[PDB]
Every structure is written in structure tokens, then in C-alpha cells.
Nucleic acid binder design. Structure first.
Ligand SMILES: [Mg+2]
Ligand SMILES: [Mg+2]
Ligand SMILES: [Mg+2]
Ligand SMILES: [Mg+2]
Ligand SMILES: [Mg+2]
Ligand SMILES: [Mg+2]
Ligand SMILES: [Mg+2]
Ligand SMILES: [Mg+2]
Ligand SMILES: [Mg+2]
Ligand SMILES: [Mg+2]
Ligand SMILES: [Mg+2]
Ligand SMILES: [Mg+2]
Ligand SMILES: [Mg+2]
Ligand SMILES: [Mg+2]
Ligand SMILES: [Mg+2]
Ligand SMILES: [Mg+2]
Ligand SMILES: [Mg+2]
Ligand SMILES: [Zn+2]
Lengths: 141, 36, 140, 140, 184
RNA sequence: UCGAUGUCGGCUCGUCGCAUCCUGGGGCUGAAGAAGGUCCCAAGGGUUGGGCUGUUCGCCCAUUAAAGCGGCACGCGAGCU
RNA sequence: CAAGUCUGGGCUAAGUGGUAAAGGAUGUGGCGCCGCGAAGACAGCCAGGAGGUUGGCUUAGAAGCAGCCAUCCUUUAAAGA
């Protein structure tokens, strides 16, 4: 799928989502990027679906950069079970995304293909997106 | 025909807006749409 | 391969009221469930437990079974006519007759009668198959 | 290319042509015959040599036609200079052929007519494009 | 290029930035002042420009100064700048990542491949009078797999960089083949 | 609500919703016609009799224009069973 | 239903106000910088609307028009593998 090979701990506390991405806000790799506008937990099955959606779109073409990674475990109790008796079992992993985060990047692809590409990938994401270019996104120094 | 996301299919498709509703007129029928 | 993914795309799952004992709830809960397979006509039921969700999956855990058996019963009849029919082994049904006595081979299918039997038993078969790939694929 | 409302443009074989395989009947759907374009046709192909003869047709609905012969397609004439038979399943930078500088002016003595330009160099740079079509290299 | 600049008295940061003026500070190895330079021209210029080409800064003193931007902090949510750092100059030798053009066609573009110009704006140590432009590199030799890098390039006389030279400047990698799927 | 709010199914009596099974209107159709498919508008009124099982539900017989799905304390025991 | 059908400036035409999301839309009103406007198409209206070549390959066929690949050049007023 797209989980981590090993982890010191298998289940971990839920947490929260205070706006601002902290990091990952500029392009820095490809030419066009997809930036998250709402905060959320993106399941690896979505990251995946979106990715495949792009390669599928411009089959045999440019390069894709997945800027996020699902390292946070998702717990879910069984069905018809009551509360308590311990924490649920891990059902998958998710990457936490905050507003401003550049989730994906593309390169070696026409500006038409780039747009269309990311527009399809955002239709697989639980949130709202924005497509970007490159310019001040040059924190080289 | 009747959907929530109505768009222009072919080049000849036109987006009319009559009686409060968003429609799509076009040469060939199969392309007709009424948002709803 | 070995696969059979019966997607819950052709199943009709019902949930009637429990039957038998129970209590103030056997009359109230839709425990009993019934999964139906339409392209076959097979139906599996279940009231073993006291929960619909533990019964529709446990009732599916069977339809998977019976099917793999009746979906395989075919692989037994569908492959038993692809092979052919000739195989009685009785006296009077030989494709080729081998003889070390007078020493010769009698291809009964062609009409040819080689004289090198001992030679054939070494793999030399280009020629009987040369004629065999004719008599056989010559009627179709 | 000629006139319309009853025409067809093909690139006939060379040497023999009467049956139906290549295009023998295709010209008959739009109006044609078997005794008008077979022997009373190869008068030109017997002259053009062999290989391909981009000669076409024009129907009138009475067994008449304007058999305006043409010069081998720049697609074929290039396989002679380089050598290859096809060209390439896919052109680009790799191709099973080669064509030096004046190699393209070898055809300069061939294609001079209907290209558009009478000269050899203002009409050869056109075939340098068929060297980016089939693939065929351009030694230099 | 050129651009107007004004002096900031140090009053209502977040406000002077809403009114339309973009905040900032100009410093160097001597003095350092606080100023405000509107988005209008700033934007327009900064994008064409960047942090490669120098700019003028005529204040109410006229005092036009040569500078290159060192720091430009965005706004995270919804791209926008909130600040900019200006490094004044002279004949004083300093650094700056110099633009990169890559005239050529890698052999990595015939059977599948695209150029990943890794460090497409290389940092080099050098003075003002020594400020080039499109510092091109050759790509006509980049095979599909294996790819160029380091400071193995055309550094015009005076180009005393600061790489390794190993710092992978660029590379060519394969496409996105439909052929995938898996599991197990 | 435990100083009590009788619990499945049936019968009787209905009434309401529409996400419509008929019947009326209608647009697409890979609509020749006849017959269908799919979506749109529309409950005004209709929406069968049996075999099996306590059954609800189902399967089956014989029909039908159709044999719609749900709510009402999975409607209705100071109405019956 | 006690006290302004008070004053000045905007917006909305949905009874929005007087519930809802992805996502749709030449709804409106207002700021933006780009096209490019007597080489006066912005829309109609008049003529064009080319040649190697049907590009090669693939293939029953692939002739701009399944698809893989390449996307250079010739002639003018214009014209794309
Ligand atoms: Mg950093
Ligand atoms: Mg008991
Ligand atoms: Mg209950
Ligand atoms: Mg009680
Ligand atoms: Mg009481
Ligand atoms: Mg009722
Ligand atoms: Mg009809
Ligand atoms: Mg309705
Ligand atoms: Mg219940
Ligand atoms: Mg009841
Ligand atoms: Mg009673
Ligand atoms: Mg009562
Ligand atoms: Mg009053
Ligand atoms: Mg008033
Ligand atoms: Mg609304
Ligand atoms: Mg909305
Ligand atoms: Mg919206
Ligand atoms: Zn249309």
C-alpha cells in the first residue's frame, strides 16, 4: 500500500490539526504543485488513487513527486462492539495535511497535461486544492 | 441528462440558463443537460 | 491461478426475524440473514448467533464454499472433453502398434508400416508425428 | 492527386496486378473493371521499373479514367538510399538505415516534378523530412 | 532592475502590510534600515527578477542602493510574502545562486525519460562587477540513467563557486509507465 | 418510564410519505414498427387468489394493467386472536 | 409588542434572508495584469481551406481523424504530418 516498514509503536494518539503547514509550503521539486486548502487526514488509499490517476492520465510521460507520507496509524474497533476493553486495531495509515501544504509535484510535462493531471488527483482527495507554478518558491537561499 | 455537475461536452454545446435552472443546448441530443 | 472474488455485486441480502427461542428480542431483532446468489440460484441462511452482522458474513463464509465446489465441478467436466475420448485400452483400439517380434511399427492411423521399432523407442518420432499432424488435423 | 466526385488515389504494386489482394476490387466499388486495369495498365509499371508506383485513378462511370502516373513515394525512395525495407515501427533517433548529405540529392534526380520547386535543393529538404518520418538516419 | 522604496518608522507591522505596502529590512556588513516596499512593483519585478539580478532602492533620500534579496518569507496558507531581506552591495565580493539554462537534449528522451535539473540555480562566490546571467550547462550528453552533476561545468573566468564539486546539480530519470499494479 | 410504557406474526380498521409497481405526461436511446432500456414530472385512484411455514421474509402454482417500498410505539391485544 | 417605517453609503432578486457538502454554472456588482484593436475579425457575412504524403509503423484498414512514434520541409494571401 504505502505504510512505513517499521515503527517503534503500532498505535498512536489521534491528536489535532491547528492550521498552517509548518513545512512543505513551497514547490522545490517539479514545475507544478497541488496545495491543500483544508486540514485533514489523507488515507494512503487516497494518496495512492490520486497518484495512479496522474500516471494514468499522462501515461508514459513526466515524473511525479508525492510530497506527503502516511506514517500515522488509523485505529477502528470491530463492528457491533461496545465501548472500552482497549484501543482498536489499526486499519491503515494516514498522512496529516494542513493548509498550505504542497502535496504533489509534476515535471517534464506540458502545462496542459500538468493542470489536467492535478485537477484529477484533487478529485480523489478529501479536501479542496489549488494548483501552482514556481517563482518565490525558491528558498534556495 | 439530469445531474449535479453539468458541463459542455462537445464544441457545439452551449450553456443556457432558463427558468432559474442551468441547461446545456447542443446540436446533437445526447448532450442535452438540465442541472438538478 | 487460484482465485474467485465474488464481489457483493450480485448478492441479495435479507434480514428476517429470528426463529426458534430467544426472548423479548428474538421477536424484535432482524438477526436471521439470507444471502442470495442469482446467476446460480444458490441461497445460504444463518441464525447460529444472535447478530445479523455476525451471520451475514458467516453466511457468506459458506456461499464462498459451495460455489468454489460447484464452480469447480465445471472444471472437471469442462476439461474432460477438451482432452478427447480415446482411452479404453481394450483390445481393438490402438493408435499405433509397436512390435519387437518381427520388428516393425504399425501406425494404424495412417496406413504406414515402419520396420524400425527398436529404433523408435529412442525418441525417434518426427515421422509418425509428421503423419500424425496430418491424419489428425486433416479433418477439421 | 487529380479531380473529385468519383476518384481514388492508391500506390499500385509493380510487375503484376489483377486479382483483389492489394486493391484490385477497391477501385471497383467506386466504379471499375478487371480488363481495363490489369494488362492495359502495366504498360506504365513495366516502365516505372518495380517496387512501388504511386499511380492513381479517376472514375467517370464508363470504364474511362485518368491514369496519371506518379513518382515513388518519398517513403519508399528512401529505403533504397539507406537499405532498410520498412523504416521503423516508431521513428525518432533510432532507425535501421543511413543517408549521407548528398545521399538526399541522389533522389534529387528523382523528385523534381510536382514537389512545388523545380530545383534539386529547394525540393530535397522535403525528403529530409521523411528521414524524420520513418527514422532513416542522415549521416552528418 | 529598478524599484521605488520607502523608509519604515517601525509602526504597525501587520497593518502597513495590509494597506498594500510590503515590509522589510535592508542590511549588509555595516548599516541596516527598516523599510516598506509595495507589492505592486515588488511582485511584478521580483518574479521577472528573483534573487539573481540586482535592484535599485530610491528612498526619500534618493540614495539608490544596489541589492539582492537574501530572505523572503511567505505566508504559508495561500502564497504571499510577508517580509524581505535586502543585502546592499558595492565592489564587495559575496555569494548568490546564479540562474541555470541547459541547452541540449539528453539521450534520455527517445525511449522514455525527463530531465530533473536538481540544483538549477547554483551558488557561487564573487563580486558585483562579476554578476552573470544564464549560466548554461551542456545536456547533449546526459544518458537516460547515469547523469551529470557536481561542478563539472563551464564556469566563466571569475566563477569561484561553493559546491563540492559533487553537489549533484542535475540528473535524468525515466517516465511514468502505465504498466504497474502489484500486491503480495 | 422497573409504586409495570403487554413484547412476533395474524385479523380488523386505516392514514400518511414518495426515494413510483401500475395507469397519465415527457427527454435521451445502441428508438424502423411492435416491444424494451434509462432518466425527468406525477400518488388521483389502483395495487389478485392459492400451496408451504407461527412466521416476518422467501420459494412455488395460477393470473394481472401492476401484483411498489416505507412511516405511524418495526400503527392498531381498555379492538379480537 | 415598549421604543426610529430614523439618517448617509453600498450589496442581494433568491422570500436568499428564514439549515447542509463535494462539485457544477456567459447570476450579479467590484477591483487585477495580460491579449491585441487603419499587417483596423470581436461576431456574422464573401473566398481560401495547398504540396511530398496515404508520414513511417501498425493493420482488414489507420489516407490529419484506434493506436505507437516523429512533428521537419516545399508553395504563397493562407494551410496543421
Ligand atoms: Mg529551509
Ligand atoms: Mg431461553
Ligand atoms: Mg430489538
Ligand atoms: Mg420498566
Ligand atoms: Mg404510575
Ligand atoms: Mg401503510
Ligand atoms: Mg416504438
Ligand atoms: Mg418524483
Ligand atoms: Mg429497530
Ligand atoms: Mg408493532
Ligand atoms: Mg389481549
Ligand atoms: Mg391499545
Ligand atoms: Mg409600538
Ligand atoms: Mg426607513
Ligand atoms: Mg444552499
Ligand atoms: Mg458550496
Ligand atoms: Mg460551490
Ligand atoms: Zn455538444
Amino acid at each position: 500500500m504505502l505504510m512505513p516498514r517499521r515503527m517503534k509503536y503500532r498505535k498512536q494518539q489521534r491528536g489535532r490539526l491547528k492550521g498552517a503547514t509548518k513545512g512543505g509550503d513551497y514547490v522545490a521539486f517539479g514545475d507544478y504543485g497541488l496545495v491543500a486548502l483544508e486540514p485533514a487526514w489523507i488515507t494512503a488509499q487516497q494518496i495512492e488513487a490520486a497518484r495512479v490517476a496522474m500516471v494514468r492520465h499522462f501515461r508514459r510521460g513526466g515524473k511525479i513527486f508525492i510530497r506527503i507520507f502516511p506514517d500515522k496509524p488509523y485505529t477502528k474497533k470491530p463492528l457491533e462492539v461496545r465501548m472500552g476493553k482497549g484501543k482498536g486495531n489499526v486499519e491503515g495509515y494516514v498522512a496529516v495535511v494542513k493548509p498550505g501544504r504542497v502535496m504533489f509535484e509534476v515535471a517534464g510535462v506540458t502545462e496542459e497535461q500538468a493542470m489536467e493531471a492535478l485537477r484529477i488527483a484533487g478529485h480523489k482527495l478529501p479536501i479542496k486544492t489549488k494548483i501552482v507554478r514556481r517563482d518565490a518558491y525558491d528558498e534556495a537561499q | 441528462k439530469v445531474r449535479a455537475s453539468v458541463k459542455r461536452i462537445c464544441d457545439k454545446c452551449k450553456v443556457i440558463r432558463r427558468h432559474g435552472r442551468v441547461y446545456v443546448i447542443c446540436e446533437n441530443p445526447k448532450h442535452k443537460q438540465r442541472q438538478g | 491461478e487460484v482465485e474467485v472474488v465474488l464481489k457483493p455485486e450480485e448478492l441479495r441480502i435479507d434480514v428476517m426475524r429470528a426463529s426458534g427461542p430467544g426472548g423479548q428480542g428474538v421477536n424484535t431483532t432482524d438477526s436471521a440473514v439470507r444471502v442470495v446468489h442469482l446467476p446460480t440460484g444458490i441461497t445460504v441462511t444463518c441464525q447460529t448467533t444472535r447478530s445479523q452482522i455476525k451471520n451475514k458474513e458467516l453466511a457468506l463464509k459458506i456461499l464462498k464454499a459451495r460455489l468454489y465446489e460447484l464452480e469447480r465441478k465445471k472444471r472437471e467436466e469442462e476439461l474432460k472433453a477438451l482432452r478427447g475420448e480415446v482411452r479404453p485400452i481394450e483390445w481393438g483400439s490402438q493408435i499405433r502398434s509397436y512390435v519387437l517380434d518381427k520388428n516393425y511399427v504399425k501406425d494404424h492411423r495412417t496406413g504406414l508400416m515402419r520396420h524400425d521399432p527398436e529404433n523408435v523407442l529412442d525418441g525417434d518420432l518426427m515421422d509418425l508425428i509428421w503423419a500424425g499432424l496430418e491424419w489428425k488435423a486433416g479433418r477439421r | 492527386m487529380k479531380k473529385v466526385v468519383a476518384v481514388v488515389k492508391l500506390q499500385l504494386p509493380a510487375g503484376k496486378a489483377t486479382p483483389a489482394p492489394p486493391v484490385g476490387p477497391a477501385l471497383g466499388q467506386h466504379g471499375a473493371n478487371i480488363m481495363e486495369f490489369v494488362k492495359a495498365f502495366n504498360a506504365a509499371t513495366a516502365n516505372m521499373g518495380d517496387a512501388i508506383v504511386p499511380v492513381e485513378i479517376t472514375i467517370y462511370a464508363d470504364r474511362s479514367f485518368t491514369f496519371v502516373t506518379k513518382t515513388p513515394p518519398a517513403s519508399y525512395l528512401i529505403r533504397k538510399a539507406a537499405g532498410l525495407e520498412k523504416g521503423a515501427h516508431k521513428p525518432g533517433r533510432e532507425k535501421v538505415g543511413r543517408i549521407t548529405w548528398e545521399q538526399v540529392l541522389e533522389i534529387a534526380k528523382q523528385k523534381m516534378p510536382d514537389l512545388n520547386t523545380t530545383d534539386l535543393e529547394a525540393a530535397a529538404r522535403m525528403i529530409a523530412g521523411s528521414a524524420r518520418s520513418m527514422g532513416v538516419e542522415v549521416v552528418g | 532592475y529598478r524599484l521605488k522604496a520607502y523608509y519604515r518608522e517601525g509602526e504597525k507591522p501587520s497593518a502597513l502590510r495590509r494597506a498594500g505596502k510590503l515590509p522589510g529590512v535592508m542590511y549588509n556588513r555595516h548599516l541596516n534600515r527598516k523599510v516598506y516596499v509595495d507589492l505592486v512593483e515588488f511582485d511584478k519585478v521580483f518574479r521577472q527578477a528573483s534573487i539573481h539580478h540586482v535592484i535599485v532602492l530610491e528612498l526619500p533620500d534618493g540614495q539608490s542602493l544596489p541589492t539582492l534579496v537574501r530572505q523572503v518569507n511567505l505566508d504559508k496558507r495561500r502564497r504571499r510574502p510577508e517580509h524581505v531581506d535586502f543585502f546592499v552591495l558595492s565592489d564587495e565580493p559575496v555569494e548568490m545562486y546564479v540562474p541555470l539554462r541547459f541547452v541540449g537534449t539528453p539521450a534520455g528522451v527517445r525511449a522514455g525519460g525527463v530531465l530533473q535539473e536538481i540544483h538549477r540555480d547554483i551558488l557561487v562566490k564573487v563580486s558585483p562587477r562579476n554578476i552573470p546571467e544564464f549560466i548554461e550547462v551542456d545536456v547533449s550528453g546526459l544518458e537516460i540513467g547515469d547523469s551529470l552533476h557536481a561542478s563539472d561545468l563551464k564556469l566563466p573566468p571569475g566563477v569561484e563557486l561553493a559546491v563540492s564539486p559533487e553537489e549533484t546539480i542535475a540528473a535524468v530519470v525515466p517516465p511514468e509507465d502505465v504498466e504497474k499494479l502489484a500486491e503480495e
